[PDB]
Amino acid sequence: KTRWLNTPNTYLRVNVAPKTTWMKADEVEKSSSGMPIRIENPNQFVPLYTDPQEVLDMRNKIREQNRQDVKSAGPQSQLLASVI
Amino acid sequence: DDDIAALVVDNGSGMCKAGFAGDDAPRAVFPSIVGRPRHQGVMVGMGQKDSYVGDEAQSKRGILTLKYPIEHGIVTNWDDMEKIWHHTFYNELRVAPEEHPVLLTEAPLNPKANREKMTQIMFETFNTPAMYVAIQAVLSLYASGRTTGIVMDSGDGVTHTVPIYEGYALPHAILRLDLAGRDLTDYLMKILTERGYSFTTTAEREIVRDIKEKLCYVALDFEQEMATAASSSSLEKSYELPDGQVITIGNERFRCPEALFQPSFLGMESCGIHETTFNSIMKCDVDIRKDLYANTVLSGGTTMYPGIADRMQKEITALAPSTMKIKIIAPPERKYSVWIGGSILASLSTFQQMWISKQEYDESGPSIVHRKCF
Amino acid sequence: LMKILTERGYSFTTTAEREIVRDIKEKLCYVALDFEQEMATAASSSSLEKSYELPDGQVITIGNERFRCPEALFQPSFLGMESCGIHETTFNSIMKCDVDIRKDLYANTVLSGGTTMYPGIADRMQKEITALAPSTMKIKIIAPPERKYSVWIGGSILASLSTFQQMWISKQEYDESGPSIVHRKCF
Amino acid sequence: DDIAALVVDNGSGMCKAGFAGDDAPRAVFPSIVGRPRHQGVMVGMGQKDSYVGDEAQSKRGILTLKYPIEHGIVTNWDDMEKIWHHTFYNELRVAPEEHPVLLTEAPLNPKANREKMTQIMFETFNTPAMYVAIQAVLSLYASGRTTGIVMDSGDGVTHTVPIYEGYALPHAILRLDLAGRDLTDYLMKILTERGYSFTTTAEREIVRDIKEKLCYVALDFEQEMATAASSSSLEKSYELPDGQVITIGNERFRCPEALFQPSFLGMESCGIHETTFNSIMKCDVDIRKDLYANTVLSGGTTMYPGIADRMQKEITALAPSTMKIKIIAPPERKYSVWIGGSILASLSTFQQMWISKQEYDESGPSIVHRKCF
Amino acid sequence: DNDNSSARLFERSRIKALADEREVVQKKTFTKWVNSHLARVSCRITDLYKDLRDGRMLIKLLEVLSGEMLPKPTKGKMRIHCLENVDKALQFLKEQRVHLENMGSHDIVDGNHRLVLGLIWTIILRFQ
Amino acid sequence: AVPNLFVPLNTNPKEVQEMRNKIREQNLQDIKTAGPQSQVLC
Amino acid sequence: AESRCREMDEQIRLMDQNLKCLSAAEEKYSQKEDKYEEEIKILTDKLKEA
Amino acid sequence: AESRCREMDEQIRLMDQNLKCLSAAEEKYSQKEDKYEEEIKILTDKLKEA
């Protein structure tokens, strides 16, 4: 039914010294030992409704641009676009 | 207002690869080494570099002590690893880290502190909007394009076998072996000692790694190959040092990678990679085994020696029952295959709902990585 | 236990390491009365931590894994096996018998073997088998303090009976009948 | 019983030789070969092409000293033949055809060294049987225990090997090219700071005598720097052969400290204590507490006063605190290898393990890898 | 050999072409931005890699962007004077807590393309 | 054959322990001894 | 010039080898498919007669 | 040296393009194999029960 995933440590939220910060909270400060994560059903990582053809179609689309050897470059930031 | 393509960053031990999502091949490939000077600087007016990072550090190997931030797939120096990540983001890809999502890879059986520290140092320092951690072998099988197979990824640092049947991965059948390229480099140094050549410094360890990459192969029959090497001197090759000195290897060409199949040379008592794959297959259920015998996938740089596929097919056929067909799938560009799969997983429209958001991180802490990703 | 000890960072791979891990299991393990409550208790504080000293001299703190290793006895889905736990196994074994003899079978449940020496195994076993059993029936578990050797003790009883002298397979009988004498002679 | 065997230890610095079953070697002499360099004018004094061993030490003024063994490797085989002939005929006065010989060499060496040694000891001296052994295993014989890690430091090379219950782990053997000759060269380098200059090969022996007489290992390095800077109580005076007087002072504990910090020589490698600790950690878990209790020092380089306390303190610092570290240094640890050789050479069960002459004839010089180790 | 030959052909085709094509366009956009800011002091750069070797253009660009006086460059045409000028510029970037990795004076002087592009991108992103 | 190729098996350690003590006895007792004299000399 | 000449000679060699292996793989590959085709037709006949 | 390296450049550029198509061809054959085997095996099973 339920599968348990253990974490040997515990992180504590600490205010900025705004940006969120998390803290180790080592064992000298009497922190909690084992943090449990419960999974009550299989295949929770994958969405339930999915067409199998889509992944293979996109694999073909990506791969044959090597075959046709494109001149495409990566995205550019907009701070460069503004000065133009 | 189109969504910007994510960044795919593959980090095994000993090499870092990075590129944009939706592209065929990564933009940047560079070794994951960091060096620091050891000698005294006497010329005034020189540049003040505390640490040489990445490929640049391999240019001036003579005056640095090279170190690796990852040992056996475990990041043992986080502040050092931050330098590789910063150099990747700002100098090679030169992209703003706050503007794109980042996808990362790791080994199967790792301490949870590795994943938690990766998530914490990615959100807190580089200030990414979203991130995800994906297992490498699943990405490689994505790159192969089949929805069912067993994949054995052997890279510098680690070797691991996972099976997948119809999109389901059995967790108890995952096997992990700490026999990798760095151990083979050390064994190559040890056996090159008795020929008459001595290498001690890490700068010479890089040279030994280059010799291993350039001149090695795997023999189909080990005893016959040793007898042939003893009878005649035809199996001999020459190499030139950066100093400039012709050395001749001879017998040691096919003995360095043979330690992959017989780990007793190193003193380790573990089984070979062929028996590791066989034991992973036999741990699975019966009705899938035939399919797992027909879809063996090799991945990683360590599987790039010539003759690995034929030797592994012969050995598995010697172990498997005779009535089944054993096929070994080895793409020519398999060394990059893991990264390629990541790009596909970064380009699916279905995947876009499963990025770990910054907002949910703010209330779930760095422990959301165990709940969200596999 | 060796697989789940990998998650904390400690690694054990050879045969001597398996012997060391078995010693760790024999020293520091127990079965929780309630899995959810004990897991939340370990989530609250750090009172469920023990330190074991390796033969190398290193000290490890196993902590949460003390009651997760024996819990595979009651929930074999951790290992991926299809079969369910020991308590419903003996419940099905009882249910395969006749209705008239079940009353004696509930009151005479005896535990034996090395694995059944985990602390708190009797209370958890009794609670689970009472949850499975009908409410009108009474449950009695029998846990000998020397259960680990009890089988051998039974053998010492069987070799002392005077009628048992008739049970022995003679050497002449074996020479006459081949190795297949044991099926017909031994029940 | 029959004829006794010969035990010969050929380190890089000095050669030792004796009969098996004896307590101490008969012949101990430096492994040098000297040849003259000046003009010879006195007619009728006779000629002498080479000076071998101790004879070259007394007349070292007019010779160029050369070492046949360099870093544990035999570079010039002709001088090795000369040394072996001198050992057999002038030092022990025995015919080599009647006696078997047992030889010693380093753990990690090129194959051609062993092959050529076997070919030389069979082809020219016509010995009936011979054998090759690792020096540190013989040290473990000399100690008399079945379990321990042994660290041997000679004039050519330093090596650590652990052995448990008679089984030696091959992957845990560590070799380091830091020895007494490198320390002698470093002493020659740091004696320049006070004004004394030694250049030729004759003065290298004077520097070696200075190092053997007036050097010691500091327990705490920085505290000794503070003490030597504060006062002049650490200075000692030595007399040169020509009659001049030198005074070392600070350099007494800086030359042997370089073993523990090889960065003084420019070497990247770790110290001897870290090498021993790493070689221990390369072993398995169950034998480590036995290796902590049986560390054995061997070789002449470990004859500095105060080496044992420094080694014990360093390894205690590196190891976990719950176990005890003891370092076993016998007072006669210079000749330990040779003593071990004797203990090996006349065992009753060892007599079946000699490499026979017929076996060499029918197998070539390649038989030494199949036997020995 | 055939698998290795095809694999390294895949590298030297795709990896090399993508990286080199990206750096060409990125260099053109960067040099246009730098010429845009450097019109105020009446200096301009034709090539990004060659003109930054002397280091006076970098000092002038930091003078433009920060609006405050830097130390004067040493009037020397030696190699070490070029290293001195580039070190002065990098030090001026160093006091104001702009983070740099793998940045050295000789990296700019010898003309490393990725390092120069990274320095220009860092100046664009973190200063303006 | 590969683990113990180099040594013969089933040997008592007491023999080696006896021989080390026998050699140490000469050191304790300070024995005069000469080397074996050759047959051709005789 | 001499360095980039060494580069491009290596290019010649590598992709010559790749042409070798690829054409040989195709030419050996064609024979097997015909054997599968003949087997299917003969197999059907054995089914229908039974 | 410069001119000879430039002259050899066109040859590498053109017969690299020659290599590219043959790659996809052998990939197509590798695809064609498998479904031929599976139709063989199902036909054999049906024949057996016949």
Ligand SMILES: Nc1ncnc2c1ncn2[C@@H]1O[C@H](COP(=O)(O)OP(=O)(O)O)[C@@H](O)[C@H]1O
């Ligand atoms: N062409 C090659 N032939 C043989 N071995 C190689 C080759 N390329 C890389 N290797 C080995 O593979 C290792 C690199 O593995 P890699 O796949 O980069 O690991 P990761 O990608 O997980 O960091 C190197 O240590 C090297 O020893």
Ligand SMILES: Nc1ncnc2c1ncn2[C@@H]1O[C@H](COP(=O)(O)OP(=O)(O)O)[C@@H](O)[C@H]1O
């Ligand atoms: N005191 C104990 N606590 C926990 N487990 C134990 C204890 N004693 C034994 N075991 C487990 O039981 C096993 C021994 O079982 P045992 O009854 O001896 O098997 P058998 O007698 O059938 O061979 C050991 O491997 C150990 O794992």
Ligand SMILES: Nc1ncnc2c1ncn2[C@@H]1O[C@H](COP(=O)(O)OP(=O)(O)O)[C@@H](O)[C@H]1O
């Ligand atoms: N009493 C001593 N004190 C300090 N160092 C010594 C002493 N005796 C010898 N040494 C050093 O040891 C070297 C000789 O070591 P030795 O045992 O002869 O090596 P090997 O026998 O392996 O050649 C000398 O060069 C010297 O540097």
